[PDB]
Ligand binder design. Structure first.
Ligand SMILES: [Cl-]
Ligand SMILES: [Cl-]
Ligand SMILES: [Cl-]
Ligand SMILES: [Cl-]
Ligand SMILES: [Cl-]
Lengths: 174, 174
């Protein structure tokens, strides 16, 4: 049946859509579900055998789960203009997981949504640098560091699809 | 504090991002959360006062909830080529709610994800016609009807923010 991969809207938009595209020419024949849901729902679904694979930047409680570190990607603080300091902007919140972090004018889990809004909310937000570089009108905020996130695959250790999980994770995301 | 609006990834991508943009120049001062989550989580969150407003194409069980019909939008079956019949294509599944509907090669809740994938999966899928028209390389499948969905606002009838819900719903989405 369908192999389900779950992740936040921003991971699908910024990196997993390309990776999923490569799985259709991999040496096997599968149908896929690209599931977009909140972290607590996806983690519960792994335990209930309702989700096959979770991709995330933070490992959850690991009892009865397995994890594999896939890589690491850079994160920078972007705005729509050059030469701006953070105190001249509205800090918008793109969700990056519980451990990553005035009320923000906008909070969301979609990088594309926060990118569209940033140009009309005098905004800045933390975005994946590789994805942000191919957008127009993004400039790093001057008083800011380059940060990063790890990327993990999480699955049920006793999953009935451990064989297919092992082969899918041979295709690199980063 | 933040006013939370919840909807599927596809409603945010196809129509609610523009609507949210108009709320920042409305005659009031609010900060917003554009929440993307699965239907069962958003409905539970309304009941638990964790979500202020749900936008959806299908009314859930309505005990202790209120609803307002906002409008109706057309849905057509699109593929990447002119003059194709559905039996020449791979039918991909974009989620449209429990009542809307071979294993599909792809199933997702993001219209942008299914649009990117459609060009490499010989695919067709049901997309909002207004949004699809501004994309390049989409053509309606020849043997297919134009369908539609209603658009509803759902909220907790006894919400402590009924006043702000009433004013937000005065800004038209469609
Ligand atoms: Cl995730
Ligand atoms: Cl969810
Ligand atoms: Cl994540
Ligand atoms: Cl929805
Ligand atoms: Cl919906």
């Amino acid at each position: 049946n369908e192999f389900s991969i779950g992740a936040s809207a921003s991971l699908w938009e910024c990196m997993l859509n390309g990776w999923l595209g490569t799985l259709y020419s991999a040496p096997y024949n599968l149908q896929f579900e690209a599931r977009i849901a909140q972290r607590q729902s996806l983690v519960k679904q792994l335990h209930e055998r309702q989700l096959d694979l979770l991709i995330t930047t933070e490992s959850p409680k690991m009892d009865e789960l397995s994890s594999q570190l896939l890589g690491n990607f850079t994160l920078a603080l972007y705005c729509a203009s050059p030469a701006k300091n953070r105190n001249e902007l509205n800090y918008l919140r793109l969700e990056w997981g519980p451990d990553f972090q005035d009320v923000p004018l906008l909070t969301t889990s979609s990088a594309e949504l926060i990118y569209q809004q940033l140009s009309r909310l005098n905004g800045c937000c933390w975005l994946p640098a590789r994805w942000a570089k191919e957008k127009h009108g993004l400039h790093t905020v001057m008083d800011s560091a380059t940060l990063s996130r790890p990327l993990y695959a999480i699955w049920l250790q006793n999953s009935d699809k451990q064989a297919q999980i092992h082969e899918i994770l041979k295709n690199p995301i980063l």
